[PDB]
């Protein structure tokens, strides 16, 4: 029995004066399957687009108009901490135990939640960093200056590092502000890719490690958000004309692969998979389920729309949260084994201290003994039993 | 209809003499494992009558005078508590006291060890039910701990301990298993365990006692997990205090070991090297509780330092009750100090700066004892990488330098090469795909040594070796998690030839997945023809054959 | 939440009726009613479930003081108070 | 049986599932199914 | 100058007393292993003086009175022979007679065991060089075998063996190593070895001696490899005669075990079930050289039959000197006879027709003894499949039928299920790709049981049982090597659900690469969304992403 | 870096009266790399096309319109056996230890060289079995009646099966005698293929586990011999017009795959990569080396000729064998570990006996013990060494 859950975050004042919807609640946590319900709530947060991060211990929420991150402990079910950052937050992602923040000044700050260490790159972006994606070896920051920068995670995270951090590559085929960034889960040199959507009605697929633009796609309206399908077969894109499009990498006319055309050739996409009514609004945020068949979109009028890609062209309304739903993040139905647990967080600080790591060490059975075989064996092990009998006699 | 297994059990227990019952214990254990149904039913049928008679014979043999019958009772109790479920657990409160009595009376140590394992299995299985902890584990547990500490307590100063060190290992393993689950009950016994396990933490050649590796690691784990018994949730404070004391002991022992060498090492944490007497043999340790037992001689100092490094490894190998502050900077500084003292090559003894007054025999002994210390440092780094995973990326650059320096110092020791290969696999899997050109160039001798070992084992320069297995496990990582642009073409050709001659399917698959491009940009030919001819019917090779060609 | 008000009131009343018919246990009825009382948005449903819980306690302790049931319910109320101090759900424990 | 499709096996791996309600036979996110609630897609199962 | 490790060896051997040398053996061996250079060079430099002094010390310790000195001598000779090469091999001439003297002296048996291992390694290394053979191995080998056989020789019927059975196991293993290399020299000792190791081939419960499994398998291996010492190239004839005699002994033992039931099995090879008395307990064996030690009792007969089946398995586990004729038809007939006796289900005692002249106790004993016999038969089939590989395809349908029958008879036994899973994996890898619909139908319950075990261990029905591991190793084979067109859809759904909920990465990739067609011929949706979300950066998905390699 | 060897066979009388090559010698074993040298000779045979089988222990050679297979012991250098068959041999192949023989009367025999069984099939073909191919699971027999039949190896090799064997499928789209068959390395039901070559100027690519004809290829002459490249990308085909052609299955326009044409649509190949003079004649046999860069052809005038497909250079004549070269077989440079070695073969005998498999059991370390670790470890293992010290004290 697998239960799928997702965390939603809203921003702004309530659209309608309804006493049923509580005003103070900014973060909800729901169960999508089998029945929709509001599993838990978190108060006092106004979270803009792409400023929510969810991990099994904590929820990170960047605050609208403030340089603040509210951290909520899911284990204790309450707001653990307020964190004040040097600059205003436009976007943030969580990768492992480090929070990556793209700011309004153009800076990138990486904050280690276990060590309380903050690394602030120089402002290589002359405008606000709009979107940030991350893989365990790379950080991609797309900003409003029509530039996408690729940074090395290991180069950013060095002890006693004094050199000013410089990105490996700059990807600037776009002619407008970058709206969205998404990455493939792969980490190889030639098989990975990233899809970037900008306000020039264009999505570009790059190979960011080689700095080569693999594909160019043009939409009728400028895209707001995207998501890959989990098996990396397709891209789901919301647009400004309230339409949802799907682009398949390996169709009859493939965008990528051996049968694909030249990368200079630009693919026009004009066939919409779905559309929302003007009273609903364009999909502000989009997410894809663990299976990949269900698709959840949050719209600035407060309703959450579920899209069954195989079954139903039209969306199905789950609930109305009376405020602009800005973030939706799914949670994996399976539990993941991690050798450390971040029970408590460490605030960012600038002081001369020895590098300290604060976590609870999980029991992972790294140490094994021969007596553990007798303990965990149902009954007694054979060779140990004849050894015991012989040493008895 | 009673089960045949239960009928055979009752008949053979009724007929067999107690003196020959241990010989038929393998029969009775397998039969009780087969007896699943009748033991699990809740408390007249013939099955119930035979079950009651079986429990009567178990209790009679357990409380009887015959040690052989007691041994058979321990085996039958272990099988019963493994099979019969909650009824068998709840009907075991005289069995626990009988099992403790077996430990108390002078029965043979095989029976005592099986009683210890059975009691540990009881106390672990009782944790599923909260009430059975209240009736059973909590009252009878201090008596079991008292009996175990009476067995492993040193009786006198002049008199050595009666029980052997593997029996002390068994007791330490059981108490290490139980301090996690019953910390409050183990709280009054923490003083006795720390005094009893003190010699086995870092034994030296000056102790004149051969201590087994299993006893050493179990004593280390028990003294680390004894922090669970700290009152007022002081587990984290005691853990931090003990690990920092261990690092300080490592530094103080490293002073007396490395007194011959002028060190250019400087401490970021602020530790300053104390002056050391030039005369006399190196010495360390104390008779007090907080110091370890004393040692004399450079070799004994080397074993003490190696044991302390393995204790630091056990720190990352054991779990914690509460979040703890890990001194990563202090550990990194300690490993940097222990890796900066370098063994000289042939003719480099004059090149390495040495103390003038120190003995040249002691210099030779230090150059002999350095690779074991480096081996322990690399094992500690491997444990830190395994525990932290992605949180050890900031440490990754320093461990690369330490590993390269250690391996280039001692490329003639197979164990050091094996540990370097394992650590290289861990580091390159962690942060390897974004290494700079200089780091890829300084990892080239490690690549060449690994390929040479693999080719030597394959015969195309032998048989299976641990070094060969470690290098074979490391080999696909050179394709998957290394920048191929930074590699020279000769190194890539060596890797391809090594993979082909070793028939390493994962390495050849990774080589086909990652093509090589030179400075001009010409694609070097793939090794896919060799892979398809050697492993034709493998499904991943089929996907490569159907996708790469198109 | 989704069901009609009259239908959910009839479901709760039917559960209480089954408890009177001794089909279900008092502990089972209380553990299937109390979380809905805590987390239900409907004021009428909360009041009705609270009234049914009070009636269940009165009927259970009418014969003799059911010490096990009283201790378990007091434990549930104490855990509800201890779990979250800032939460307002402790008023139900106070009122009960 | 339907005739041979030359590009079905690879499109089944490299394209999205076109069958309505996929993975319903897995029942990963649903309730456990008894005999009356089980799936009997083919004529052999229906017949038996 | 001399290496520091060699200098430390010489200094510690000079300074240390002989009694505390076993304490310092771990480091001395490490230093000698490091000193591979000077010992390998032929025989004035300081290296030469230290090597000659070290060799003189080794000879003095070997010829010395001190048992601790002899122990250290054995350890250091083992190290020197390991890293010395031809020079140490030719200079080890007094060391052989010294080691045989250590065996003859009343020394501790750990020292005797290490001497035996050193002598075995020394003779194996001598086998390569033919001059070394006739100058060293030919005269000394009768003395070594004579000393070992005098140590393991039974003194009398009333007098038990002085040396323990682990030492007897060491002697058996050493002679097993040496009979292959030297057959003619060990030919005079062939007769006495059989009489010495006769009571450890198939030990029973009537011998009152607990025989270790290592001694059992080493005695079986030695009495099979003794065919190497056959005169006039009679190795094949002796091997065939011995295996046919073993099959006949299995049949005669199975008569006494299966007196309880009337068998419908009719031999296709020629054996006739002779009548057996129905009065008293079954008995067998004798005191002749061609017969195993006697037994009395049904369980003792079952243990004899299991030991004889494992002795048959050792024939396929051991090599042969010359081509030998394997009686596969007789083995199949014997295994069919043993697997046609199905133990009854619950409440089905009248389901199996039996002789009405016996007891219920004997019936219940046979119904418990049968799964062990079937399990030994299954390991025998595993060994036959592993040895023959594609030459056992004619045996495919018979072993499948026996596996199905045994698994359905004993589906509640975890060990029987585990060995059935291992055998199923081997057979399906062999000829499972073309099995008909009837064979798939009779393999369906095993698929369901394996998936149930994997899902039980995964917690979607804790530690991993061997049954769970054996079923998890078999789960990818159900996709790769099974006709998916003959598989019912519910079985495919159960397999895919098991793979996804158990995170079996090979099974999910196999399900993706071997899709299930419906009655329409339309392919089922691929697991791949789950594979990428659980293992995103594994080689399994990196090979499926090969269409983006360019 | 590798040493490749190949075996060549002779049929027919010597064409030249006076030559340095001996007239009697019928089988040669050469080393192609690094330099050409005749490693060994085998004394007398007249081997037709597709009548040679080479293992690591034996060489089996069918005679010319004579029901004898001459068996030569490769590990002894002599002629071991003159094995007689009930019918004359048109073709023979070796799989494992089974010699699969297609006769002149349409029959298939499977001779188990280790047991002595000679399984015979009914004459499902109506003319001579021209060509045979074998997998670990299937056996494909193509005859002169334009018919290819697929047989299952297990039901062919069942011990007590007395029912008359019948083929699973009949691959019959050809209209002339089947010249050659090749089999893809994969044996899965969805990825396997077999490529035929018949006298109807055509080659058909089949899925021999479903019967679907995946591709039809038209050549300007009828194919004589063929070979898949080791990576299964290209089909080298010799034709009647003394020319060598490549059909590249996954090239600029894939014959198989997502971008492929309709299987009914026929692909015509008209570009030869190689040509031979009328003096040399058409190639009577083709084979491709282990690397795949090197290719050898045999010609009826005696020339063994090397083609470099990589550099597209001119073919190089190695030697002249004074008579027609009908069979060329490369031996793998690497050795595969086989637990049983067939030192001697057993002639087929039809008599009542137990199933006896005879071979030499090779040492493959099928058992393990604690003392084997002590022997194989250079020095002593640590924990065993302190165990020995404690046992001493």
TrEMBL record, chains A, F:
Gene3D superfamilies: YVTN repeat-like/Quinoprotein amine dehydrogenase
Pfam families recorded: WD40
WD repeats: 122-161, 171-216
Record has Glycosyltransferase as a keyword: no
Keyword terms, alphabetized: Nucleus, Repeat, rRNA processing, WD repeat
Subunit structure: Component of the RIX1 complex, composed of IPI1, RIX1/IPI2 and IPI3 in a 1:2:2 stoichiometry. The complex interacts (via RIX1) with MDN1 (via its hexameric AAA ATPase ring) and the pre-60S ribosome particles.
Name this protein carries in UniProt: Pre-rRNA-processing protein IPI3
Family to which the UniProt record says this protein belongs: Belongs to the WD repeat IPI3/WDR18 family.
InterPro entries with a match to the protein in the record: WD40/YVTN_repeat-like_dom_sf, WD40_repeat_dom_sf, WD40_rpt, WDR18/Ipi3/RID3
Biological process according to GO: DNA-templated DNA replication; rRNA processing
Subcellular location: Nucleus
GO cellular component terms, semicolon-separated: nuclear pre-replicative complex; rixosome complex
Main function: Component of the RIX1 complex required for processing of ITS2 sequences from 35S pre-rRNA.
UniProtKB/TrEMBL annotation, chains B, E:
Domain named Pre-rRNA-processing protein RIX1 N-terminal: residues: 5-207
Key word Cell inner membrane present: no
Annotated compartments: Nucleus
Any one GO CC term of the record: nucleus
GO BP term, example: rRNA processing
Keyword Nucleus belongs to the record: yes
Source superkingdom: Eukaryota
Disordered, as annotated region: 272-293
Main location (coarse class): nucleus
Keywords: Nucleus
Annotated family: Belongs to the RIX1/PELP1 family.
Record's protein name: Pre-rRNA-processing protein RIX1
Source organism of this protein record: Chaetomium thermophilum (strain DSM 1495 / CBS 144.50 / IMI 039719) (Thermochaetoides thermophila)
The organism's taxonomic lineage, starting at the top: Eukaryota, Fungi, Dikarya, Ascomycota, Pezizomycotina
Span of the entire protein shown here: 2 to 600 of 781
């Amino acid at each position: 029995m697998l239960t799928e859950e997702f965390v939603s975050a809203i921003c702004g004042p309530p659209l309608s004066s309804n006493t049923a919807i509580a005003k103070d609640v900014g973060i909800y946590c729901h169960t999508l399957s089998p029945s929709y319900s509001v599993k838990s709530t978190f108060k006092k947060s106004s979270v803009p687009v792409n400023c929510l991060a969810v991990s099994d211990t904590h929820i990170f929420a960047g605050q609208h108009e403030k340089a603040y991150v509210h951290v909520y402990s899911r284990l204790r079910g309450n707001q653990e901490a307020f964190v004040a950052l040097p600059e205003r937050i436009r976007c943030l992602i969580l990768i492992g135990d480090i929070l990556v923040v793209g700011t309004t000044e153009g800076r990138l700050m990486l904050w280690e939640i276990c060590t309380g260490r903050l690394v602030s790159t120089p402002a290589r972006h002359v405008q606000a960093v709009s979107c940030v994606a991350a893989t365990p070896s790379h950080v991609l920051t797309g900003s409003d200056d029509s530039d996408i920068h690729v940074w090395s995670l290991s180069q950013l995270l060095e002890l006693d590092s004094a050199a000013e951090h410089e990105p490996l590559r700059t990807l600037a085929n776009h002619r407008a502000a970058i709206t969205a960034l998404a990455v493939s889960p792969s980490d190889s040199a030639d098989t990975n890719f990233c899809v970037s959507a900008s306000k020039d009605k264009s999505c570009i697929i790059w190979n960011y490690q080689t700095g080569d633009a693999l594909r160019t796609l043009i939409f009728p309206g400028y895209p707001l958000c995207m998501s890959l399908d989990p098996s990396s077969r397709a891209i789901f894109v919301s647009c400004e004309d309230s339409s949802l499009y799907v682009a398949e990498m390996f169709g009859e006319k493939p965008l990528l692969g051996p049968g694909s055309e030249d990368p200079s050739t630009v693919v026009q996409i004009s066939t919409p998979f779905g559309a929302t009514q003007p009273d609903v609004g364009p999909a502000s945020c989009l997410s894809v389920s663990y299976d990949g068949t269900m698709l959840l979109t949050g719209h600035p009028r407060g309703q959450i729309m579920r899209w069954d890609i195989s079954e139903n062209k039209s969306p199905v309304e789950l609930a109305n949260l009376n405020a602009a739903v800005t973030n939706l993040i799914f949670v994996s139905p399976f539990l993941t084994s991690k050798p450390t647990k971040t029970v408590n967080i460490i605030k960012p600080s600038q002081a001369e201290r020895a590098y300290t790591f604060t976590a609870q060490f999980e029991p992972m059975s790294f140490t094994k003994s021969r007596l553990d075989s007798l303990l965990n064996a149902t009954g007694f092990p054979a060779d140990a039993l004849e050894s015991a009998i012989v040493a008895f006699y | 209809t009673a089960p045949p297994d239960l009928r055979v059990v009752c008949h053979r227990l009724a007929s067999t003499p107690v003196d020959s019952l241990p010989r038929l214990c393998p029969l009775l254990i397998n039969h009780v494992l087969r007896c699943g149904g009748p033991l699990s039913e809740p408390q007249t049928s013939e099955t119930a009558m035979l079950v009651h008679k079986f429990r009567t014979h178990i209790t009679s043999l357990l409380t009887g005078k015959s040690p052989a019958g007691r041994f058979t009772a321990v085996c039958l109790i272990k099988a019963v508590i493994d099979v019969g479920g909650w009824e068998s657990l709840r009907s075991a409160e005289p069995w626990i006291r009988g099992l403790i009595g077996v430990l108390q009376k002078p029965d043979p140590l095989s029976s005592k060890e099986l009683s210890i394992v059975t009691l540990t299995k009881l106390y672990i299985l009782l944790q599923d039910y909260q009430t059975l902890i209240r009736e059973m584990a909590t009252p009878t547990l201090p008596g079991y701990a008292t009996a175990c500490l009476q067995l492993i307590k040193p009786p006198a100063s002049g008199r050595p301990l009666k029980v052997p060190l593997n029996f002390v290992d068994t007791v330490a393993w059981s108490l290490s298993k139980l301090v996690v689950l019953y910390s409050t009950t183990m709280r009054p016994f923490s003083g006795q365990i720390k005094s009893a396990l003190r010699p086995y933490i870092a034994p030296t050649s000056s102790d004149n006692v051969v201590v087994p590796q299993s006893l050493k690691e179990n004593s280390r784990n028990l003294l680390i997990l004894l922090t669970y018994t700290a009152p007022k949730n002081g587990s984290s404070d005691e853990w931090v205090k003990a690990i920092r004391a261990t690092i300080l002991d490592c530094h103080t022992t490293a002073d007396q070991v490395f007194r011959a060498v002028r060190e250019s090492w400087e401490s970021t944490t602020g530790y300053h090297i104390q002056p050391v007497n030039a005369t006399g043999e190196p010495s360390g340790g104390g008779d007090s509780v907080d110091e370890l037992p004393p040692w004399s001689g450079l070799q004994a100092g080397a074993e003490r330092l190696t044991g302390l490094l393995e204790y630091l490894t056990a720190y990352f190998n054991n779990p914690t009750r509460a979040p703890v502050n890990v001194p990563l900077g202090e550990l990194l500084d300690l490993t940097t100090r222990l890796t900066l003292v370098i063994p000289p090559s042939l003719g480099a003894e004059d090149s390495i700066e040495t103390n003038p007054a120190i003995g040249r025999d002691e210099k030779a002994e230090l150059w002999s004892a350095l690779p074991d210390i480096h081996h322990a440092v690399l094992r500690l780094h491997c444990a830190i990488i395994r525990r932290l995973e992605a949180n050890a990326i900031p440490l990754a650059t320093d461990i690369i330098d330490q590993m390269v320096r250690v391996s280039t110092a001692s490329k003639q020791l197979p164990s050091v090469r094996e540990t370097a290969y394992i650590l290289a696999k861990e580091i390159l899997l962690l942060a390897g795909s974004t290494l700079p050109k200089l780091t890829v160039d300084i990892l080239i001798p490690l690549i060449q040594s690994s390929c040479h070992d693999i080719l030597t084992a394959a015969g195309h320069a032998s048989t299976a070796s641990p070094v060969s297995q470690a290098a074979s496990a490391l080999l696909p990582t050179f394709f998957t998690h290394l920048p191929q642009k930074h590699l020279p073409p000769d190194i890539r050709g060596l890797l391809d030839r090594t993979a082909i001659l070793s028939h390493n399917q994962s390495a050849m698959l990774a080589s086909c997945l990652h093509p090589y491009r030179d400075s001009r940009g010409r694609y070097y030919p793939s090794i896919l023809p060799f892979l398809v001819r050697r492993f034709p019917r493998d499904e991943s090779v089929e996907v490569l054959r159907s996708n790469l060609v198109k | 939440t989704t069901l009609d008000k009259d239908l959910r009131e009839k479901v709760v009343g039917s559960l209480v009726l089954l408890r009177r018919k001794d089909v279900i246990d008092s502990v089972s009825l209380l553990t299937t009613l109390f979380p809905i009382l805590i987390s239900s948005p409907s004021k009428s449903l909360r009041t009705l479930i609270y009234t049914k819980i009070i009636s269940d306690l009165r009927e259970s302790n009418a014969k003799a003081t059911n010490h096990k049931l009283n201790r378990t319910i007091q434990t549930v109320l104490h855990n509800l108070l201890t779990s979250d101090r800032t939460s307002s759900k402790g008023l139900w424990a106070c009122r009960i | 049986p339907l005739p041979y499709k030359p590009r079905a096996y690879w499109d089944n791996i490299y394209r999205l599932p076109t069958t309505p309600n996929p993975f319903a036979y897995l029942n990963l996110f649903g309730l456990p199914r008894d005999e009356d609630s089980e799936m009997y897609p083919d004529r052999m199962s229906r017949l038996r």
